[PDB]
Write a protein that binds this ligand. Structure first.
Ligand SMILES: Cc1cc2nc3c(=O)[nH]c(=O)nc-3n(C[C@H](O)[C@H](O)[C@H](O)COP(=O)(O)OP(=O)(O)OC[C@H]3O[C@@H](n4cnc5c(N)ncnc54)[C@H](O)[C@@H]3O)c2cc1C
Ligand SMILES: Cc1cc2nc3c(=O)[nH]c(=O)nc-3n(C[C@H](O)[C@H](O)[C@H](O)COP(=O)(O)OP(=O)(O)OC[C@H]3O[C@@H](n4cnc5c(N)ncnc54)[C@H](O)[C@@H]3O)c2cc1C
Ligand SMILES: NC(=O)c1ccc[n+]([C@@H]2O[C@H](COP(=O)([O-])OP(=O)(O)OC[C@H]3O[C@@H](n4cnc5c(N)ncnc54)[C@H](OP(=O)(O)O)[C@@H]3O)[C@@H](O)[C@H]2O)c1
Ligand SMILES: NC(=O)c1ccc[n+]([C@@H]2O[C@H](COP(=O)([O-])OP(=O)(O)OC[C@H]3O[C@@H](n4cnc5c(N)ncnc54)[C@H](OP(=O)(O)O)[C@@H]3O)[C@@H](O)[C@H]2O)c1
Lengths: 490, 489
């Protein structure tokens, strides 16, 4: 029998995690990674989406925006800054790439050290236990394995409209853009769309977001709106209820000049403006189509493209497994994939019975004002637990760090969502403020311990720190009490 | 009487209890008075945290950080010129401007909630009777059914000469009318290192004189790492020395002073000269001269603390004590607020809810910040028995530093687990940026008796410093390498 115990299709966050984990148990392991180029032909190394065109470059470019904010603040803390400092897109994306690059090389090294076989090729199933590896130039080799991990993730979706593929960029492209994007239209309004609009605007560019329906579908809608309001108040332009119909090159250039024409969601009306870059951040389809799943009979959701999967990450075909984003009804987040992948390797070759817990996974939208949250949204706790069974403690706050710069009072906002039928279990947690990620993490662990509101209250705050607001959340939404206004002192 | 309740001290605990008691419609009075420092410094309503503690300390910390932030911004593409300079006066001006609005916020808040504010020193004269010596000297005599002693502490000096007339405390630093210049900081707990940290961080020549160990009371390994970090980023350390005398070599703003220090064990002597000497060497409670004899409140004579029931009651049943002046408690603001707020609940609202002093999270705001909650490594060994303790720990590198390309493998996290208890995380520690924000949540997680296997089942947030705690697999006992790093493996 076979060439490897395990072949992982995809060298992503989930891929490399399972890969690197399976190696502790001394087994023949192979990773296939291959970066199918974007429309305008962009490439990148081992590491997957987070490393190359996701969290890593996105956070870094976020930080670049924050740091501009930081420079503005420094005046009032006594730093003799000259009047305005300017931003250099090239210098920035260069450092980002320099870090991405070392991550790429880090993983290629890490695989070698753990003795995993790396093959930079496209994996396509050809028959039971048999995969074809089409390498970069065209040559194919055929490999076999006892088990398989499908960990191929997704890629940005385009609109069904013309001009979009040849003239627009996706998340995949922005992060290595060889020129300042200039005036930008970002189309779509979930984490990627707003995050990107947020940092582009933050480094000084003229940015507009074109919203089809609601902001951040799926996330607590009140929080979403506050994020939107914040973004608008800090110089991001919003075009509400419009979809683009065509993108046409009015010039070539780096950046070019493009013309976007958009129809209304309900009226008949038409708008035209012209931008330097159009960012299409409008969802992502799974790479499950062209991996030759037919030839081994893995069932996939035909409509969505996701792979349904047992609570053990097993596909309908018993030797084949799926990990990460391509899974159905899961969270498409990196730490999830890593965990899932790492724990799957435990089960297979280490005899752990520990499953992957997909419940109450914390997330953070890295909008200019960051939004971190964990558990259920207000509407969903109402839906799940019955309206007047839900109690919501909430409040605004002002990071001490902003007082001296004297800006943005009463913009930061925290709330816990509590289940009255359950000892006020904090079944929902939300915070809109700086370092939202850091704040949330702890409480997510606290949620895994089934935290109750009265336990939260018995926990003493840390002062002066943003997260302490959660220790003293006394005003309920139901109670109607004023939460503004403020004061500071009372 | 005249009042249901008189709160002696308008501090964190004071104003908290005061503002809380007001909901229950009672005649309340706050006496606050700021007894001036040796060199005669004053401030408004709000207490230590507001005027000469957390508020101005964090702000000045932030100023330091922002300098770091400017340095970093170059590699993120900001066309900074080569070096930006700092202006002490412009800084301490903004800080005061904020402190000022806080003063004039609490004064309003008391008025709105209808509490009576009297800016006067409170001294007990007999049962249910207090004397209020106002600022100019006139006294009035008030009465109340109950009393809250909420007087907090003040910086202690060394028993040596020159120190009162030539040195500054925490109390003075935060309104210093001139750039402190080259500084010696004496002492090595939160105040000493925090201050040394931000002073150096805004560009000054800073030396810390350590008597024994760093941060006595806090996990000593973390303390040392804090020390190492501070030294690696340009803070000078004089280990095992106490100053014997401080003598003015000049008057000036800043002056020029000569510090002479003896060794902890050897006979040796050192001399240097600094512009400012910051004495951060403990604080004594203001329990002495509040006329406690005249109402017979027992105080620990040795320490000055007020022993108190699990309900913040002193031995005298109508008299209560809140916050820092309490014996065997934490001297932290949120604690005093909570204690005070909850005491007012019991008295006038019939809540039976006590104040939980267990596993109060704290944060040392040293340049590399240190947050922690629960037991230290030595104390969990001591309390729970050496080989019953398992420690999962690891270094990390905030993504934010990779581009500026600095300070890999400096940030460090550990949980302390009790093997006799399902690996209860009875100890939590993190050295890294935004430590405060990181810790808070986990403190709540500890109050829920978090176990290591629950921590593990919790998914991380990426890329975020705090996620390190979700994946702490290497044990200290196991001996595994935690350096080195990589990033990718
Ligand atoms: C702009 C952006 C920002 C994001 N921000 C965050 C964030 O802040 N925090 C967070 O937790 N998550 C974030 N995410 C989501 C995150 O990228 C994913 O959750 C994560 O990368 C998924 O890992 P994976 O292994 O499932 O898929 P991927 O990481 O995408 O791994 C799949 C890899 O395999 C390759 N491949 C595909 N088909 C084949 C094949 N047939 N043969 C060989 N190789 C193949 C792919 O090209 C890719 O390299 C972000 C995503 C984007 C796009
Ligand atoms: C430099 C420094 C940094 C600190 N940083 C932090 C931090 O980051 N986080 C944190 O949680 N804690 C911090 N603290 C500790 C914090 O200051 C205390 O925990 C908190 O202020 C105590 O509140 P309190 O009401 O107990 O005392 P205080 O706030 O001191 O209140 C006492 C008030 O009453 C006045 N008074 C005294 N005697 C009388 C009298 N007889 N009559 C009338 N008035 C009187 C005092 O002058 C003072 O105004 C810091 C302290 C210092 C010095
Ligand atoms: C990874 O996730 P992600 O953030 O990339 O996306 P995602 O979370 O899958 O959701 C798609 C986002 O793009 C929007 N969108 C989808 N098709 C669109 C279209 N034709 N025109 C305008 N907006 C469209 C969605 O708005 P809707 O809520 O209106 O679908 C939503 O804001
Ligand atoms: C609020 O707390 P805080 O941070 O102000 O202080 P604190 O936590 O009460 O502790 C006092 C700090 O100052 C030091 N100290 C006390 N007396 C000293 C002396 N005579 N010479 C040098 N150092 C001395 C202590 O070191 P030791 O641990 O050596 O006592 C400790 O570092």
């Amino acid at each position: 029998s076979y060439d490897f115990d395990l072949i992982i299709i995809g060298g992503g966050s989930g891929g490399l995690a399972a890969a690197k984990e399976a190696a502790k148990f001394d087994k023949k392991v192979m990773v296939l990674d291959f970066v199918t180029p974007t429309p305008l032909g962009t490439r990148w190394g081992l590491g997957g989406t987070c490393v190359n065109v996701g969290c890593i470059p996105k956070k870094l470019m976020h930080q670049a925006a924050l740091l501009g904010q930081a420079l503005k603040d420094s005046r009032n803390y006594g730093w003799k800054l000259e009047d305005t400092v300017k931003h250099d897109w090239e210098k920035m994306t260069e450092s980002v790439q320099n870090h991405i690059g070392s991550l790429n090389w880090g993983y290629r090294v890490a695989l070698r050290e753990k003795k995993v076989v790396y093959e930079n090729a496209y994996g396509k199933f050809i028959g039971p236990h048999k995969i074809m590896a089409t390498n970069n130039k065209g040559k194919e080799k055929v490999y076999s394995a006892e088990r398989f991990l499908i960990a191929t993730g997704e890629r940005p979706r385009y609109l069904g409209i013309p001009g979009d593929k040849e003239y627009c960029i996706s998340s995949d492209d922005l992060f290595s853009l060889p020129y300042c994007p200039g005036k930008t239209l970002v189309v779509g309004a979930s984490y990627v769309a707003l995050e990107c609009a947020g940092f582009l605007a933050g480094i000084g560019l003229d940015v507009t977001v074109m919203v089809r329906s609601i902001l951040l579908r799926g996330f607590d809608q009140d929080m979403a709106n506050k994020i939107g309001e914040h973004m608008e108040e800090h110089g991001i332009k919003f075009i509400r209820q419009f979809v683009p119909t065509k993108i046409e090159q009015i010039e070539a250039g780096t950046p070019g000049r493009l013309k976007v024409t958009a129809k209304s969601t309900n009226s008949e009306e038409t708008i035209e403006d012209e931008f330097n870059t159009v960012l299409l951040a409008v969802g992502r389809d799974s790479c499950t189509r062209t991996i030759g799943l037919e030839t081994v009979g893995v069932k996939i959701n035909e409509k969505t493209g996701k792979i349904p999967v047992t609570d053990e990450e097993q596909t309908n075909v018993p030797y084949i497994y799926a990990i990460g984003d391509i899974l159905e009804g899961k969270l498409e987040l990196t730490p999830v994939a890593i965990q899932a992948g790492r724990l799957l390797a435990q089960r297979l070759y280490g005899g752990s019975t520990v499953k992957c817990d997909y419940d109450n996974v914390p997330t953070t939208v890295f909008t200019p004002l960051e939004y971190g949250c964990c558990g259920l949204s207000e509407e969903k706790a109402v839906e799940k637990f019955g309206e007047e069974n839900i109690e919501v403690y909430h409040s605004f706050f002002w990071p001490l760090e902003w007082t001296v710069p004297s800006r943005d009072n009463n913009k930061c906002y925290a709330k816990v969502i509590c289940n009255l039928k359950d000892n006020e279990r904090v079944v929902g947690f939300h915070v809109l403020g700086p370092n939202a990620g850091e704040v949330t993490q702890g409480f997510a662990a606290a949620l895994k311990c089934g935290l109750t509101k009265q336990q939260l209250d018995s926990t003493i705050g840390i002062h002066p720190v943003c997260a302490e607001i959660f220790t003293t959340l006394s005003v309920t939404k139901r109670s109607g009490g004023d939460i503004l206004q403020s004061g500071c002192x009372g």
